[PDB]
């Protein structure tokens, strides 16, 4: 019977690297035919596949993790390697490796990254529809205390976002005064009083409480009929 | 009255280095380009910020390039720069350089940006990654009922597709390959087949020891993908 043994993982401080062994008894790695696999799966997530590794010494990896993750093999110890380096909380995940359709698994080894959480921002609505002269409403809900630390930005095709309001409310000079913002919580909202031709675009709410800066999905505000 | 202006984007193969040059007239950089921001735009999509200058000399990056991007400047030139190493597919997008204000706390907001310069990464002849859409996210249903979940590749995968389950705290197990064949082990209820570009995993008279989540998994291609998973619930646990 075949088993695969991990071994590796832990907390690991952001910028560190881990090297994650995956030890094979009941078959031979240097077979002809045989590859090991390593897949991640975040915590709540799915799988994703990162490498692998055939008995010619071969190697595919993920984009995810080019230029960091290295697949290697000891075939005196039987044993298949996953080097990662750079590490960020968006590395953390169980690690498996499976032998190879992925028939036999390792048990998993739980790499945990870190030393806060990003902050989300939920944009709504993803879109709408309006004619000239109508108000409209857009709003950015932070997923934890931002204080007033929120600006809004336009954007139209083919051309760099345009600063509207920062700091929540303050406009910024040369824009019109028909743009407003305000906050309640961390629950944001730009309102255009009266829309006009020039302000049919997309509109970005962005966070600067803390690095990494985020931003919204993006309203898109459309001409009713289309 | 200021400009700036970005070169340096272009045409890159799997794995390939760049380096972006943001250049700034009509005011001088602050030392060490302190504020310059990077935000980049793939196409069709938001913004997601990359990478700031800022203050004591800790500059600040987005997780999915740390390692791979370095910011820099030489104010000399009143240039910024995004050196890019590492880069793939998902780094294809239009690159913007902005400056943030500086003087206060209260106040990091982006006026000024560059025009954009756009990063085109191919994939080498590998072609676009195959999507496996999976479908329902969930289900809930009783002992005994029959239980049928599909899959949809994004390409033709022709046959080369596997069915797994995988319960909490446990690794996936291999449940079906190549479609259709049922692996040694696997309880006579579960099936697997293809029409065309969509694939079926059907349980028969559904057992307790069969709420679990399952997935599927092309090979057709490398990156090999699975689906988001299918959670088998028991109908009335909400």
């Known amino acids: 019977?075949?088993?695969?043994?991990?071994?590796?993982?832990?907390?690991?401080?952001?910028?560190?690297?881990?090297?994650?062994?995956?030890?094979?008894?009941?078959?031979?790695?240097?077979?002809?035919?045989?590859?090991?696999?390593?897949?991640?799966?975040?915590?709540?997530?799915?799988?994703?596949?990162?490498?692998?590794?055939?008995?010619?010494?071969?190697?595919?990896?993920?984009?995810?993790?080019?230029?960091?993750?290295?697949?290697?093999?000891?075939?005196?110890?039987?044993?298949?390697?996953?080097?990662?380096?750079?590490?960020?909380?968006?590395?953390?995940?169980?690690?498996?490796?499976?032998?190879?359709?992925?028939?036999?698994?390792?048990?998993?080894?739980?790499?945990?990254?870190?030393?806060?959480?990003?902050?989300?921002?939920?944009?709504?609505?993803?879109?709408?529809?309006?004619?000239?002269?109508?108000?409209?409403?857009?709003?950015?809900?932070?997923?934890?205390?931002?204080?007033?630390?929120?600006?809004?930005?336009?954007?139209?095709?083919?051309?760099?976002?345009?600063?509207?309001?920062?700091?929540?409310?303050?406009?910024?000079?040369?824009?019109?005064?028909?743009?407003?913002?305000?906050?309640?919580?961390?629950?944001?909202?730009?309102?255009?009083?009266?829309?006009?031709?020039?302000?049919?675009?997309?509109?970005?709410?962005?966070?600067?409480?803390?690095?990494?800066?985020?931003?919204?999905?993006?309203?898109?505000?459309?001409?009713?009929?289309? | 009255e200021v400009q700036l202006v970005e070169s340096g984007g272009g045409l890159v193969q799997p794995g390939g280095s760049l380096r972006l040059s943001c250049a700034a007239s009509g005011f001088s950089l602050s030392t060490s380009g302190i504020g310059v921001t990077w935000v980049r735009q793939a196409p069709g999509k938001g913004l997601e910020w990359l990478a700031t200058?800022?203050?004591?000399?800790?500059?600040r990056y987005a997780d999915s390039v740390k390692g791979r991007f370095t910011i820099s400047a030489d104010t000399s030139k009143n240039t910024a720069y995004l050196q890019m190493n590492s880069l793939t597919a998902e780094d294809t997008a239009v690159y913007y350089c902005?400056?943030?204000?500086?003087?206060?706390?209260?106040?990091?907001?982006?006026?000024?940006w560059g025009q954009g310069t756009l990063v085109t990464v191919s994939s080498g002849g590998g072609g676009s990654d195959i999507q496996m859409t999976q479908s329902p996210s969930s289900l809930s249903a009783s002992v005994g009922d029959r239980v049928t979940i599909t899959c949809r590749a994004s390409q033709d995968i022709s046959s080369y597709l596997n069915w797994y389950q995988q319960k909490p705290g446990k690794a996936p197990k291999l449940?079906?390959?190549?479609?259709?064949?049922?692996?040694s082990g696997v309880p006579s209820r579960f099936s697997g087949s293809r029409s065309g570009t969509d694939f079926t995993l059907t349980i028969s008279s559904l057992q307790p020891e069969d709420f679990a989540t399952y997935y599927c998994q092309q090979y057709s291609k490398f990156p090999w993908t699975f689906g988001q998973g299918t959670k088998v619930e028991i109908k009335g646990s909400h």
């Open positions: 200058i800022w203050w004591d000399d800790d500059n």
């Open positions: 700091y929540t409310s």
């Open positions: 902005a400056q943030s204000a500086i003087t206060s706390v209260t106040d990091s907001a982006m006026d000024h």
